[PDB]
Design a binder for these strands. Structure first.
Ligand SMILES: [Mg+2]
Ligand SMILES: [Mg+2]
Ligand SMILES: [Zn+2]
Ligand SMILES: [Zn+2]
Lengths: 1361, 260
DNA sequence: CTGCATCCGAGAGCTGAGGGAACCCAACCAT
DNA sequence: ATGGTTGGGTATAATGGGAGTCGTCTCGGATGCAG
């Protein structure tokens, strides 16, 4: 079995379809209503699709195996596996060709481009509204000859094909002013009140009376509608002959004697334009035959035709009349389109467009290029255009459109069966009508309906009203509906599946678990590991065989005790995967060792809750079991929870103490401060001790003795080592928060027993005293940031195992000390400062002043509104400051204050709302109210303030609700556009780099100010130095990975003015195909070491970018700005930039304003709205691409002006601005990868000596390779310009049709791929996932997946051999 | 552009109708054309259907794509026949043309009858096309010697064609015409009983009202066999993500445990 | 022959759990 | 040997249908205007 490497898609010929089919479906019957067996020649017949039962024909002659390939003579059913019913197709032979709607309705239509017909014309021809001309045969329409590919309405064709034959109903009993059979010119009156309008003869229809002479005298006979006249006009009669033949013997009119005949009072007149020819013998051409000039008609050729027309021999007068018509050949519908398609010669058309490509017109050139694209696709693929017209329609196998009996006995069927039934009914009716010689109106209607049925089968609900089943408004789902959409095959069954060996349950906190363990209920483990448990019980004596084990395990009450021990032995060493939806980053799935617990809840470690973004208010998580050795190895080595301690997005610790742990550590590591002594002066320490003993000074009061600050605690309690200090704490002599002097590590430290205990905890956790002493910060309370830094430093210095041990010890001790700390929340703990009252009264003062200033005309409404807002904002800020100063000075251990300061929970704004006041509120229109909320949540709100705050609450809720969906969509788009980027080699060999700056222009352009430390870290940490750097007597060599310490060293050097920018490698300049290299990427941020070859960095980058957007980013600003930047949309607040260099000269008039940029070569002008704001001043110099107005810059204009690098830097910086505004840490690498994918394409300006066309967009690498080969051969290189397209359009333009088809716009991608005959090489990850293959990443990378392993003994044996 | 019903109606309207004189003329032409066809069949000694096919090909012309060589050969094989016996051929050609005009002019009877048959499982256009099929049959079998108007003979054929099409194409599972009529009788009897008695009737009452040969058991079976399959994509729940067919298990293929 | 500039139609918008209207008439094939 | 099925016929005159939807945004061809 060869391996599958490529997948090709192409158009299918009618021959191919007929070779696929096992037979034609001739009847619309589905199943018999009595026997529930398939009907012969129906949609489920077993002769075509295969038997329902395995190895058993329909009539039962054969019911055993070995008959493979044998077809029963009686029933015609092959004997084989029944599974063939889901593979074998059928087909329907159309009476008339029908057009494939995919190639008709996808704008622009492929048939329209090939046949140079607009969409309206194509729709008119295909759906039987207008004719199209083939072989005009020299016809004349309105004096102009008709030419091929001309569209005629029904009226022009009927005139050309048949002629003009007007009829006038002459009133009964009125004679005509003309006689039958004489040429009548236009305007010659045919009656006293009827006038002709066309040239030609007038013909009598049902003359009301007949005058017959008799040898003379006349006689009159009345001619009634129910009878006809036989004798021709102006023909003599004989005696006994009949004139007015009748049905009734008594009513017959026989001529008495011989006389002439005349016909008067005609009922109607038929005026035609035709020629007349008498004859006296047999004629040659009969009615309905068309003749040409100079053709024999009668009399052996004596009479000859002079014009083209249709001949009809009127026997009544024995005269041949030729009506002027032509033999023009106009056809309708897909048959005509196919006939036009087969006559097309592609080489001549290609030459014609190549000649057209020399036109000075740009629009003509673009249209010709668009036509050439499809023409060349057809020529290269080898597909024939006529294959876009269907002659036989394939029929899907029945098992994919099942008709099944539900458990309740009713029937359930697919809509495809009804669509096929409609198609078959219309096809059969068309065949019957064609076999009957029906008139052309009925046939045209039948063909229109057949075309509409084919369209509904292929794409229902695209043209016109969708087809629905009677009694319902639900449109039927066609094959395309099955293929595409959120519920379609690709997105619902190929990129994601339901799986076995899985479960789900609610999660519960697992504080006693280790970092790598999770609590699994016994029942879940028994159900999940059932086959392993059966095998292990087989090993023991619990069951004789697997079936006995299964029956025993089947009933709950039949399970014993030893089976639980067998299960415990089964799961020994194995891990399971835990997953919480939604999975925003890779950490949403993690591997854990299961510990069997009682109950029904999964127990989760507290330290992974932040990584999972999981809480314990009802959240549920799913459990999966990796089966094979490879899966278990991957889970244990790459997905273990203890092995994933740093964030892949920022490199900062992600599994870290949180919530109660910080609270406990901060409580035990905080030191008391007292005011009883309050800096009193003492001369000798003994006096201080006596004062403390008398009760005059506090134990921890900051006193001064002999000119140096100290406290009574430091002098009274001197401990030799930590054990004595902790023993004294245990006896109640001192508390954990008292400051004493302790001898530790050979030094005398003025510290508290709590800080010593924390140091001992860390040192005993890491099993190293010197390193632990180096890592910790002793002289500060332990809070979130210090603990995170400690975890990061411990990781770097010792490794992930010791970091996990330290984390577990910190968690345990934090919980233990948080339990006994005495943390609680009462109403009196939200202390309201007294200053608040004053702050309010002051405001109430200024308010009055403001009102006065408004009543005397000095202020308008707008100014007063702004002043009120400003005053209340400043009051709110002042109240915040007063609240926190009060908390720090009077109640240093207040629970809310400790929670806010330690970082465990809460932010200053919430504390201010709790204590001081809520503040200003926004109306639903977005503008602030005039009165603020002056009540806090402790005092209790009134109804009105609560109601006004409801506006902001509701707006925030709705904002969240929309933001989550928009962020999910953005994450999906980013993952789809970057999914193919992998680390594929060690070094691409490039010499390009980027220069990361360290100083940014000031907002007033005063000078360059140093960027924030966080931004420099995010832009420099982990990168590879492109060039050597000399800073502070330190030589950073080329190719060095920048660790955090190096980043700090460069920042310090920048603060000393020795350096202004850093040259580094980046993915933006990497040259590896379909990915990046190890050096151009840098660190794997989750391990603080160079990234391994084979890492799927595109998916990681996309997830990393998308994660914060949900919820973290709020909503020109916020998430809309990120969406606009990643799609390269032109901003609606667009600014004006200078395309060229020059000096600025602002010219302002009383009505308009403009800016002229005058360089040394040329002087350009920019007209701008007067309301705009200018960033320039008269007489300054601006570079290309610098802005002249405030607002967002259009990326395409910047690309035109400066080039690719400037746009790269602008996009990266602007995308990072939004994330930095929210406080989110995110490395530049991910955005750089996304931007590199964003700018993947170029446009050809001059093809040179290549086969490419001007304006053809193509991948940059391909054109570079083409240029390289061309210069090697000695030709003219192709000239190209870079392009920039949003993420959606970049993703839809990829080479792989599978990923593009599974992304979006499925019909367009599929039709283009089928026309082009594209081959999918399976380079990216999605195609391999769709095919169920091993992805070319991780263990599936070619760099690592061929490695072998062997011991020394076997290797030596092979060496001897 | 869209709405094919409007296009079809406009095209039908572009053809004028006939008056009594025109109708009798066309019918008489049709009759003499069939008589001439039979006379030519006797004269040449050939099977009538083949000569009919030759005449149809000649009226329709080269435009209508039986092959050109055969029809041309026999066309000239009839031109060999002597005069006096040739008028029949021109009469047959005229009669075939007359059939074309008659059908085009009387197409409106199809729409007029069929517009009151909507809502029986068949769309309007299928009803109309089947009515045109009945109209062709009525035209071919019409005898004008009875002096009856065409509408009288055409309406019966139209109703028969439409009703047969309803019985054959209204249901996914084909049920014979007689059983469909039986179901029709059952439904009308049930609704009449419900209307008179004022509540949903029981099976025994309907069986008693049908007459001899009908019991409650047969009535249950008849209602059972009149059931139509449901769609696998019926939306379940508020959100548009759960379908009925997603809850249907396979009971045919062996399970992994059974295979092991 | 450019360039603007609306003008119209097409195709998308988080996961997961759970969702419940005729009658007759007579020949003819399967089993 | 038996019912259930399959196709054919009905004669005053009968002649252009009928349902309908509204609180979205963004992108890319298509048409018509000034220069
Ligand atoms: Mg929750
Ligand atoms: Mg002491
Ligand atoms: Zn058989
Ligand atoms: Zn590289």
């Amino acid at each position: 079995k060869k391996e599958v490497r490529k997948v090709r898609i192409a158009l299918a010929s009618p021959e191919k379809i007929r070779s696929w089919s096992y037979g034609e479906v001739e009847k619309p019957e589905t199943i018999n209503y009595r026997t529930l067996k398939p009907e012969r020649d129906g949609l489920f017949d077993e002769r075509i699709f295969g038997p329902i039962k395995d190895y058993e024909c329909a009539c039962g002659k054969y019911k055993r195996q070995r008959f493979e390939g044998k077809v029963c003579e009686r029933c015609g059913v092959e004997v084989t596996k029944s599974i063939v019913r889901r593979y074998r197709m059928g087909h329907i032979e159309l009476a008339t060709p029908a057009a494939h709607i995919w190639f008709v309705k996808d704008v622009p239509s492929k048939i329209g481009t090939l046949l140079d017909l607009s969409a309206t014309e194509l729709e008119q021809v295909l759906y039987f509204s207008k004719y199209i001309v083939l072989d005009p045969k020299g016809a004349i329409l309105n004096g102009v000859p008709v030419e091929k590919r001309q569209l005629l309405t029904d009226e022009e064709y009927r005139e050309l094909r048949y002629g003009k034959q007007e009829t006038y109903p002459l009133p009964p009993g009125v004679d005509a002013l003309v006689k039958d059979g004489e040429e009548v010119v236009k305007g010659q009156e045919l009656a006293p009140g009827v006038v002709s309008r066309l040239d030609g003869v007038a013909l009598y229809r049902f003359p009301r009376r007949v005058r017959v002479e008799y040898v003379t005298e006349p006689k009159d006979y009345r001619v009634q509608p129910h009878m006809n006249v036989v004798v021709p006009e102006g023909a003599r009669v004989e005696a006994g002959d009949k004139i007015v033949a009748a049905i009734d013997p008594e009513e017959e009119v026989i001529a008495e004697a011989e006389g002439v005949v005349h016909l008067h009072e005609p009922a109607s007149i038929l005026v035609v334009k035709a020629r007349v020819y008498p004859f006296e013998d047999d004629v040659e051409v009969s009615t309905g035959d068309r003749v040409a000039p100079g053709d024999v008609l009668a009399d052996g050729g004596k009479v000859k035709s002079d014009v083209y027309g249709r001949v009809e021999v009127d026997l009544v007068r024995n005269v041949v009349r030729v009506v002027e018509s032509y033999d023009i050949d106009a056809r309708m519908g897909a048959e005509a389109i196919q006939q036009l398609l087969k006559e097309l010669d592609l080489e001549a058309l290609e030459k014609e467009l190549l000649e057209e490509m020399k036109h000075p017109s740009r629009a003509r050139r673009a249209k010709a290029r668009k036509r050439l694209e499809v023409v060349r696709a057809f020529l290269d693929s080898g597909n024939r255009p006529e294959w876009m017209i269907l002659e036989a329609v394939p029929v899907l196998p029945p098992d994919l459109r099942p008709m099944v009996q539900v458990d309740g006995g009713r029937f359930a069927t697919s809509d495809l069966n009804d669509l096929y039934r409609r198609l078959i009914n219309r096809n059969n009716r068309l065949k019957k009508l064609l076999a009957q010689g029906a008139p052309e109106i009925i046939i045209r209607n039948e063909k229109r309906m057949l075309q509409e049925a084919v369209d509904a089968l292929l794409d229902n609900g695209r043209r016109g009203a969708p087809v629905t089943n009677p009694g319902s408004d639900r449109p039927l789902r066609s094959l395309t509906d099955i293929l595409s959409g959120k519920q379609g095959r690709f997105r619902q069954n190929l990129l994601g599946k339901r799986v076995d060996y899985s479960g789900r349950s609610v999660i519960v906190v697992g504080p006693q678990l280790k970092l790598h363990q999770c609590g699994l209920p016994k029942r879940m483990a028994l159900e999940l590991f059932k086959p392993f448990l059966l095998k292990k019980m087989e090993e023991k004596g619990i069951a004789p065989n697997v079936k006995a084990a299964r029956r025993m395990l089947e009933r709950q009450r039949d399970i014993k005790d030893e089976v639980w021990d067998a299960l415990e032995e089964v799961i020994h060493g194995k891990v399971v995967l835990l997953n919480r939806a939604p999975t925003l980053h890779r950490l949403g799935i993690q591997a854990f060792q299961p510990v069997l617990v009682e109950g029904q809840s999964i127990q989760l470690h507290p330290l992974v809750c932040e990584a999972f973004n999981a809480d314990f208010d009802g959240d549920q998580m799913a459990v999966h079991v990796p089966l094979s050795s490879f899966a278990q190895a991957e889970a244990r080595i790459q997905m273990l929870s203890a092995h994933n301690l740093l964030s892949p997005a920022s490199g900062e610790p992600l599994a870290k103490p949180s919530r109660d742990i910080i609270l406990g550590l901060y409580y035990i590591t905080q030191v008391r401060k007292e005011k009883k002594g309050a800096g009193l002066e003492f001369a000798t320490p003994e006096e201080a001790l006596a004062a403390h003993e008398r009760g005059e000074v506090a134990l921890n009061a900051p006193i001064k003795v002999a000119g140096r600050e100290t406290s009574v605690g430091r002098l009274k309690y001197v401990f030799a080592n930590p054990d004595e200090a902790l023993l004294a704490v245990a006896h109640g002599i001192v508390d954990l928060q008292d400051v004493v002097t302790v001898r530790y590590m050979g030094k005398r430290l003025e510290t508290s027993p709590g800080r010593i205990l924390f140091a001992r905890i860390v040192a005993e956790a890491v099993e190293d005293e010197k390193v632990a002493w180096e890592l910790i910060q002793l002289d500060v309370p332990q809070e979130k940031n210090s603990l995170k830094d400690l975890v990061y430093q411990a990781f770097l210095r010792l490794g992930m195992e010791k970091t996990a041990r330290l984390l577990d010890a910190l968690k345990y001790y934090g919980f233990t000390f948080s339990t006994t700390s005495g943390i609680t929340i009462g109403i009196d703990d939200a202390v309201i400062p007294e200053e608040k009252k004053q702050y309010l009264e002051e405001a109430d003062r200024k308010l009055l002043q403001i009102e006065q200033a408004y009543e005397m005309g000095f202020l308008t409404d707008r100014e007063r509104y702004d002043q009120i807002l400003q005053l209340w904002t400043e009051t709110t800020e002042k109240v915040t400051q007063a609240v926190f100063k009060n908390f720090e000075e009077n109640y240093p251990f207040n629970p809310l204050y400790v929670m806010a300061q330690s970082g465990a929970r809460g932010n200053p704004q919430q504390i201010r709302q709790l204590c001081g006041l809520r503040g200003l509120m926004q109306k639903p229109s977005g503008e602030t109210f005039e009165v603020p909320v002056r009540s806090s949540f402790r005092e209790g709100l009134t109804v009105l303030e609560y109601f006004i705050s409801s506006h902001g609450a509701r707006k925030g809720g709705a904002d969240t609700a929309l933001r989550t969906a928009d962020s999910g969509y953005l994450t999906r788009k980013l993952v789809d556009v970057t999914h193919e980027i992998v680390v594929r080699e060690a070094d691409c060999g490039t010499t390009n780099y980027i220069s990361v700056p360290l100083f940014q222009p000031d907002e007033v352009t005063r000078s360059l100010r140093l960027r924030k430390r966080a931004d420099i870290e995010a832009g420099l940490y982990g990168r590879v130095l492109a060039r050597e750097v000399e800073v502070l007597g330190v030589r950073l060599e080329e190719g060095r990975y920048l660790s955090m310490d190096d980043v700090h060293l460069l920042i310090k050097a920048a603060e000393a003015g020795e350096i202004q920018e850093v040259p580094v490698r980046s993915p933006l300049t990497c040259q590896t195909r379909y990915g990046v290299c190890q050096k151009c990427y840098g660190y794997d941020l989750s391990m603080a070491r160079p990234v391994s070859i084979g890492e799927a960095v595109g998916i990681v980058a996309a997830q990393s970018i998308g994660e914060p957007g949900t919820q973290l980013t709020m909503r020109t600003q916020g998430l809309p700005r990120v969406i606009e930047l990643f799609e390269a949309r032109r901003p609606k607040a667009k600014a004006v930039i200078s395309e060229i260099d020059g000096v600025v000269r602002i010219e302002e008039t009383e009505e308009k304003l403009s800016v002229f940029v005058e360089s040394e070569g040329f002087s350009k002008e920019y007209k701008l709205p007067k309301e705009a704001r200018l960033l320039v001043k008269d007489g300054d110099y601006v570079e290309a691409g610098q802005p002249l107005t405030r607002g967002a810059i259009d990326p395409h204009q910047l690309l035109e002006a400066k080039g690719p690098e400037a746009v790269e830097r602008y996009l990266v910086e602007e995308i990072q601005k939004v994330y930095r505004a929210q406080g989110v840490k995110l490395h530049d690498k991910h955005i750089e990868i996304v931007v590199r994918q964003m700018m993947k394409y170029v446009e050809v300006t001059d093809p040179g000596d290549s086969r490419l066309l001007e304006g053809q967009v193509l991948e940059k690498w391909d054109v570079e390779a083409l240029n390289e080969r061309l210069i090697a051969e000695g030709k003219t290189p192709v000239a190209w310009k870079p392009l920039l397209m949003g993420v959606t359009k970049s993703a839809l333009s990829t080479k792989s049709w599978l990923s593009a088809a599974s992304f979006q716009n499925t019909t367009h991608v599929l039709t283009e791929a089928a026309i082009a005959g594209k081959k999918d090489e399976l380079i990216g990850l999605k195609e391999n996932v769709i095919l169920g293959r091993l992805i070319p990443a991780g263990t599936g990378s070619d760099f690592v997946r061929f490695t072998q392993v062997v011991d020394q003994k076997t290797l030596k044996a092979i060496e001897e051999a | 552009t869209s709405d094919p019903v409007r296009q079809y109606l406009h095209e039908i309207g572009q053809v004028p109708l006939l008056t009594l004189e025109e109708e009798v003329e066309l019918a008489r032409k049709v009759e003499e054309g069939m008589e001439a066809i039979k006379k030519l069949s006797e004269i040449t000694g050939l099977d009538p259907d083949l000569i009919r096919e030759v005449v149809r090909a000649k009226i329709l012309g080269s435009a209508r794509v039986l092959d050109p060589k055969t029809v041309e050969e026999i066309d000239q094989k009839l031109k060999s026949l002597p005069k006096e016996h040739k008028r029949y051929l021109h009469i047959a050609r005229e009669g075939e043309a007359a059939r074309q005009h008659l059908i085009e002019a009387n197409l409106r009877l199809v729409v007029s009858i069929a517009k009151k048959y909507t809502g029986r499982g068949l769309s309007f256009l299928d009803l109309i096309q089947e009515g045109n099929q009945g109209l062709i049959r009525a035209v071919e079998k019409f005898e004008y010697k009875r002096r009856f108007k065409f509408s009288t003979y055409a309406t019966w054929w139209i109703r028969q064609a439409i009703n047969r099409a309803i019985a054959d194409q209204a249901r996914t599972i084909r049920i014979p015409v007689h059983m469909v009529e039986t179901i029709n009788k059952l439904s009308r009897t049930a609704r009449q009983l419900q209307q008179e008695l004022g509540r949903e009737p029981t099976y025994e009452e309907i069986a008693e009202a049908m007459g001899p040969g009908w019991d409650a058991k047969r009535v249950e079976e008849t209602l059972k066999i009149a059931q139509e399959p449901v769609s696998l994509e019926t939306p379940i729940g508020d959100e548009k993500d759960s379908f009925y067919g997603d809850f249907i298990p396979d009971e045919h293929l062996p399970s992994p445990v059974d295979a092991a």
